[PDB]
Amino acid sequence: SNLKPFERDISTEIYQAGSTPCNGVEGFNCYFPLQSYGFQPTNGVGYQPY
């Protein structure tokens, strides 16, 4: 679910997108909520860090 105003919520629980209770292994409909994009000096305006 979405966030309420100014709430923080640290959690490494792998997100079951469906009804598959993976409970420790990433898979189809079981992903991590934390994702990371990288920043390179050769990237475009919209993809550079601010």
Partner 1 sequence: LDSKTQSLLIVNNATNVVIKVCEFQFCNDPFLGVMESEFRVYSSANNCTFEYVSQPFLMDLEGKQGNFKNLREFVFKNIDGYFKIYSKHTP
**What gap in Å lies between CA 40 and CA 48, rounded to an integer?**
7
Residues in the site for partner 1, rule: CB under 8 A?
A: 4-13
Nearer to partner 1, 12 or 42 (CB): 12
17 in Cβ contact with 29 (< 8 Å)? yes
Nearest approach, Cβ of 33 to partner 1 (angstroms)? Answer: 12
β-strands 15-16, 30-31 pairing: antiparallel
Nearer to partner 1, 9 or 25 (CB): 9
Nearest approach, Cβ of 50 to partner 1 (angstroms)? Answer: 23
